[PDB]
Amino acid sequence: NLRVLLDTAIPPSFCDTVSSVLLDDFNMVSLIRTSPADSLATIKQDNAEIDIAITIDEELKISRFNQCVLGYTKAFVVAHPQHPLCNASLHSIASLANYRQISLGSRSGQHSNLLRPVSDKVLFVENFDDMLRLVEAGVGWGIAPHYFVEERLRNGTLAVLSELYEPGGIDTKVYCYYNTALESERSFLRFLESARQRLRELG
Amino acid sequence: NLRVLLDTAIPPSFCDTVSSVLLDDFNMVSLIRTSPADSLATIKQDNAEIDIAITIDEELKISRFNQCVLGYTKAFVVAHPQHPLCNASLHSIASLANYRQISLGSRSGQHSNLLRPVSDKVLFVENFDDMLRLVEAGVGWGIAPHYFVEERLRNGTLAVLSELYEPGGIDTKVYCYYNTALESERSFLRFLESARQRLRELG
Ligand SMILES: CCCCCCCCCc1cc(=O)c2ccccc2[nH]1
Ligand SMILES: CCCCCCCCCc1cc(=O)c2ccccc2[nH]1
Numbered sequence: 001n002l003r004v005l006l007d008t009a010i011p012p013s014f015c016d017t018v019s020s021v022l023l024d025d026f027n028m029v030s031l032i033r034t035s036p037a038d039s040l041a042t043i044k045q046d047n048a049e050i051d052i053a054i055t056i057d058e059e060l061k062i063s064r065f066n067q068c069v070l071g072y073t074k075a076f077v078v079a080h081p082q083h084p085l086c087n088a089s090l091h092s093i094a095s096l097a098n099y100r101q102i103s104l105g106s107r108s109g110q111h112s113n114l115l116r117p118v119s120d121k122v123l124f125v126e127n128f129d130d131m132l133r134l135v136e137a138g139v140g141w142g143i144a145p146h147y148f149v150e151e152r153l154r155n156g157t158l159a160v161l162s163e164l165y166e167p168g169g170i171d172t173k174v175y176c177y178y179n180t181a182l183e184s185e186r187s188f189l190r191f192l193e194s195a196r197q198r199l200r201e202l203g
Numbered sequence: 204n205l206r207v208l209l210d211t212a213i214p215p216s217f218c219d220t221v222s223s224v225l226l227d228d229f230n231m232v233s234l235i236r237t238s239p240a241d242s243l244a245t246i247k248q249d250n251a252e253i254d255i256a257i258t259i260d261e262e263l264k265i266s267r268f269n270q271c272v273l274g275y276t277k278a279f280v281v282a283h284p285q286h287p288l289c290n291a292s293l294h295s296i297a298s299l300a301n302y303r304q305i306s307l308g309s310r311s312g313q314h315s316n317l318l319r320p321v322s323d324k325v326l327f328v329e330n331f332d333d334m335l336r337l338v339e340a341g342v343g344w345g346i347a348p349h350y351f352v353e354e355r356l357r358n359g360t361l362a363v364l365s366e367l368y369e370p371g372g373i374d375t376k377v378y379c380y381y382n383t384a385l386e387s388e389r390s391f392l393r394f395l396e397s398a399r400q401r402l403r404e405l406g
Pocket of ligand 2: 212259277278280296299317318321346347348364365368373375
């Protein structure tokens with residue numbers, strides 16, 4: 001029955017919050033994980049027959065789907081704690097566009113404004129694990145969700161650069177793309193209401 | 204000396220917060236108001252010789268300028284309290300793309316993804332006052348900053364539709380575009396630090 005796709009930028013908590021709720025109302029629920037760079041591409045494939053996507057990625061008006069927002073979540077631009085650009089911010093926060101960035105690659109090779117890399121050179125990868133191996137290494141810098149990075153962060157293995165750009169990490173909305181058929185379906189509305197109401201915390 | 208441009212979506216408080224601070228460090232400070240639809244166009248004109256823009260509008264990498272974020276602020280999609288789409292949300296929240304929208308026109312006729320109208324027909328205007336005359340009228344619906352609308356809102360003259368899309372109004376970042384020359388200038392940094400630190404409230 002209900003197939004829902006969850007990108008990797010979504011905290012793995014925001015995912016049990018969901019799944020608990022949908023089983024009340026639904027009797028078969030499949031959960032698919034996906035690069036954020038591939039989320040929206042995927043739901044456009046009709047055969048893939050997704051009914052709900054949870055992503056950070058944005059695009060206005062899609063084919064058969066509607067959009068709304070569930071919450072907010074944070075990402076950081078990170079590097080090795082002696083990457084040149086470490087320390088020395090504001091000026092160097094503009095020089096990111098010169099340094100090598102480790103970006104999430106997409107299947108379609110295409111990117112949204114939101115996820116397109118800011119610099120060159122870019123070195124593409126499949127997911128945030130590969131990304132951090134590399135910035136820990138540390139060739140390049142990257143933007144990764146909080147949940148990934150906070151482990152290493154307090155451990156001093158990685159440092160943040162995002163801070164003078166946006167203190168507190170880069171606030172980023174979490175969207176919900178849902179097949180229009182679910183608009184005003186007593187059950188979907190419960191999921192929305194309940195997912196949101198919960199997803200204040202973590203925050 | 205210092206010329207700073209402030210779009211109309213910026214609360215008129217976020218504007219005294221700024222202006223107080225800059226006079227400590229600056230001795231001539233001009234403040235220009237602008238449609239958000241025209242903010243960025245304007246700072247690209249070189250003759251206009253703007254040193255700092257405060258806008259909700261977004262564009263990545265501009266000519267001589269850097270970007271960072273000062274805070275957050277809210278906007279609502281509003282209409283006449285017996286506009287068809289009133290009441291009846293979620294489905295109708297998708298039918299906005301069919302109803303007439305009152306959008307902020309731009310000089311260049313061009314719009315960013317962020318400000319481009321969602322529907323047609325569109326009926327362009329110069330500013331948020333014209334916009335509300337019209338949605339109060341009420342031909343069409345529009346998106347307007349909180350500060351404008353909260354007056355009329357509790358007064359029942361206008362109703363919100365944004366709520367199932369994004370409860371609490373549509374969170375929207377407030378960017379700072381500052382000429383690169385000001386990067387690491389003891390004074391600019393004070394302004395940033397102090398503007399931000401204050402602009403938590405209102406919120
Ligand atoms: C200091 C440089 C700021 C440039 C960042 C531009 C805004 C962030 C957009 C964004 C890009 C991502 O790759 C991303 C990845 C995971 C989660 C949020 C993200 N936000
Ligand atoms: C319920 C329909 C949601 C569609 C709104 C799309 C996100 C809002 C982007 C935006 C458009 C504006 O015109 C605007 C104007 C002033 C302040 C913030 C704004 N945000």
